[PDB]
A paper describes a structure:
Three of these complexes generated crystals: full-length [name] bound to [name]; full-length [name] bound to both [name] and 85RF45.1; and [name]-D2 + 3 bound to both [name] and 32F3. Datasets were collected to 4.2 Å, 3.72 Å and 3.69 Å, respectively. In each case, the resultant electron density maps were sufficiently detailed to allow us to build a model for the central domain of [name]. This domain contains the epitope for [name], also allowing us to build a model for the [name] Fab. The most complete electron density for this region of [name] was obtained from crystals of full-length [name] bound to [name]. The AlphaFold2 model was therefore docked as single rigid body into this electron density and was rebuilt to fit the density. This generated a model for 122 residues of the 150 residue-long N-terminal domain, with a root mean square deviation of 1.63 Å from the AlphaFold2 model. The N-terminus and loops 62–68 and 163–168 were unresolved. In addition to visualising antibodies 32F3 and 85RF45.1, our crystal structures revealed the epitope for [name], an antibody with weak transmission-reducing potential which binds to the central domain of [name]/4512. Indeed, transmission-blocking antibody [name] has lower efficacy than either 85RF45.1 and 32F3 and binds to an epitope in a less exposed position on the [name] surface.
Numbering used by the authors:
A (entry chain B): 2 to 138, 144 to 224
B (entry chain A): 45 to 60, 69 to 162, 169 to 360, 368 to 428
C (entry chain C): 1 to 217
The structure:
Amino acid sequence: VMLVESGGDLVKPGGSLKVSCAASGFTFSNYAMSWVRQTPEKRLEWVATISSGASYTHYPDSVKGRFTISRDNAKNTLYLQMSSLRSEDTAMYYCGRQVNRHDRALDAMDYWGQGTSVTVSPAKTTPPSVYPLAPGSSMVTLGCLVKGYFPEPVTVTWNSGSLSSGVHTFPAVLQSDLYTLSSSVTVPSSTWPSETVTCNVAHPASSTKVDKKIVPRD
Amino acid sequence: IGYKCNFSNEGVHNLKIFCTIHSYFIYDKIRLIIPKKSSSPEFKILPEKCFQKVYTDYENRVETDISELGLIEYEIEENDTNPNYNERTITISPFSPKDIEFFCFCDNTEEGRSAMVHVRVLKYPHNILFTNLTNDLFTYLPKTYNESNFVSNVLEVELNDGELFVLACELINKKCFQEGKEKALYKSNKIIYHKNLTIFKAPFYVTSKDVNTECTCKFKNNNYKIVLKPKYEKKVIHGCNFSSNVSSKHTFTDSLDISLVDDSAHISCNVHLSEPKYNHLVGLNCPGDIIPDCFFQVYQPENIVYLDSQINIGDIEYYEDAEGDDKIKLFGIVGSIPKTTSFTCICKKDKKSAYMTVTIDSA
Amino acid sequence: DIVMSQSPSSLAVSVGEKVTMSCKSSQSLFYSSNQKNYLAWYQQKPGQSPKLLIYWASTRESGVPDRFTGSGSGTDFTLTISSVKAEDLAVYYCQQYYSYPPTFGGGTKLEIKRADAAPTVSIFPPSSEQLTSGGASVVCFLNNFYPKDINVKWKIDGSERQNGVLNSWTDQDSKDSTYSMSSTLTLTKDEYERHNSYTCEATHKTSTSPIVKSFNR
Ligand SMILES: *[C@@H]1O[C@H](CO)[C@@H](O[C@@H]2O[C@H](CO)[C@@H](O[C@@H]3O[C@H](CO[C@H]4O[C@H](CO)[C@@H](O)[C@H](O)[C@@H]4O)[C@@H](O)[C@H](O)[C@@H]3O)[C@H](O)[C@H]2NC(C)=O)[C@H](O)[C@H]1NC(C)=O
Ligand SMILES: *[C@@H]1O[C@H](CO)[C@@H](O[C@@H]2O[C@H](CO)[C@@H](O)[C@H](O)[C@H]2NC(C)=O)[C@H](O)[C@H]1NC(C)=O
Ligand SMILES: *[C@@H]1O[C@H](CO)[C@@H](O)[C@H](O)[C@H]1NC(C)=O
Ligand SMILES: *[C@@H]1O[C@H](CO)[C@@H](O)[C@H](O)[C@H]1NC(C)=O
């Protein structure tokens, strides 16, 4: 059983966006599907559900009209057309699957997807500015700084994903209309400065050639 | 629609030709002609109470009563009231879970047209959905979705192509399964009511995906609601589009505007089919007068005859519709045919006459 | 139109003790005919998808350990676990499905008991590259401690400041169950040379005296 989402992207307040959801490991036409979103306060809320034969559809009274659920059994895909988006609509969207052990139109979700992030802010898509963090003037602890980027997310890895020796990727925070994030890692004193210390950064919808290593200056 | 076997000379079959029925029909009458007082010179029925006791095999006819076969919920009336002929009747239920068959016979005196009677019942090809909300127990062990399956006193149910919906409601509710709720309605082929036990036959050809119908049955001071809706699938119509209009909800294989051709050539529009098993829709869209009555009474190939008489398949549903002056008649077919057959229908507008010949193969 | 009041919000429990949760309901969730309570409980592991555990508010699904046990009827619903493991640090939501729309609760996080540890503070001066394009930010790291409560204040040549401060907290780590906090003061290049003494104090339960850390340009 696998459920792959796609389509997460920022859009200006009022625009529109279409997302997808692929299915694997079961007969699509035999199960009902549904979508569920999660606010930045990690509060869950139901958004839409559609039946197997794509005839009976239900939405909550808050999003009625602007959101359009749809499914294509031939391709095993589930679609959701969001229109006239607002600040409130920004969240993480999952395409859970209703259980049909009971022949009831309404039931719980056995298997969930992984999610895809949509953004409503009218902020300009800006690339990050990575800066190294080294101490000036016992075990070594290094850091990396990512400031001035939009939007989330940004993936940080050390030495090309080959460093899990106490790595902390702190959550991001909004300053004015630009994000800011940092990461840390504690290595033995014997390692630095004799070993390689690469800070790998990545950003979606944008290009990111930044593998800045930390220089032990002054 | 209804099966009838003439044992008088007034009909097509005369008795002064055999009647073979290999079908699966549901809750229907069966009329049997038998003149008794007028003249019965050694004219008998074999056995005397055929609808109560009837044999099982022609190679060895043994006495077997109706209640010792495996049939479910039948009705045997034997009226001798009409002053012109005497009638024998029986009703068939679809709940039969097996394929059973029987034989009856009739004898004459004067080389008096001896006829043979062979009928076999088929367990319904598709499946049926039972919902016995009314408190009444059945040992049929079918698929029954009782009180619990309703979400806050409403039930949404989609039907595949050719399924039956069963609903047990001993309470009298009007406009049941005939008043659609949306702008278009879910047209059923057969809605019947016995012991106020509802039946809905899902058609194979529909127009729009947003069609529906309702029934607001009552039970224990509660108004439950059932809404029907079809599992949509758009299918081409094999035939000839003669109407000039392009904006239509039907898609035809062959196409030609009959209004723009010349008057000197009455051209035809042929259609051929060759598959092992069949499941297609066949009709035409004629803006003018359609003659003869198509498709129940098509014209014979190279004479007016019944459609089911030539195809020899009971599963032939008929569908009709019009869009302004455009007249659209068609029919659907499911199942292998016994022998390759043909037929024609004719469209005529003013001084123009087009002919649509169809050919259906067995292999 | 269905209110699911979950309580409590946080829950600090030891490693292996019986934990009890509740899910309040604004209306009855019970069909008298079927005799089953319409409710379900979920588990959202850290940074992962929520998964179903108990449907019908009593029975488990195929693939759920026996430690879990749902209970309750009508409106008062309870969820009890026996021998807590280590990655069970998830947020558990309870969903209803009696009537549309299916509403969810607020969730209940699962804090793990831990032997309180002192924080590992470490200050960092601005890099040379950030200084070249008109920017100067000092980052103080406090990567490992317990419990979450901590207060970091800045010193700038004796002055206490809180304007350009930015903070982030990681959730309970699945590797050692220790929290982490980062602080960041952002300022223009020019304001940096105006001062020279910068201090990141740290208040904790482990030491009565504050845990300071300073650097001078
Ligand atoms: C409509 O069809 C439904 C099919 O699911 C019927 O649901 C069944 O209804 C009966 C009677 O209310 C329930 O039986 C009761 O169960 C309780 C609970 O004890 C145990 O019950 C079953 C026994 O196997 C078990 O699965 C449970 O977990 C409980 O441990 C008893 O205290 C009662 O004495 C009685 O036995 C069924 O549980 C319930 N479900 C099923 C799947 O059978 C419903 O009754 C029908 N309604 C109408 C109006 O016809
Ligand atoms: C409707 O169909 C159901 C199908 O479950 C039947 O209910 C029976 O209810 C009795 C109650 O004691 C059970 O012992 C039987 O086992 C049930 N039948 C089956 C097939 O499980 C019944 O025929 C109909 N009526 C009601 C009220 O349910
Ligand atoms: C069933 O109800 C209908 C309501 O229209 C009524 O016409 C009919 O007489 C009732 N009884 C039977 C056996 O159909
Ligand atoms: C009907 O037939 C005409 C023939 O001229 C064709 O132009 C038209 O497209 C047909 N309509 C449809 C819906 O195919």
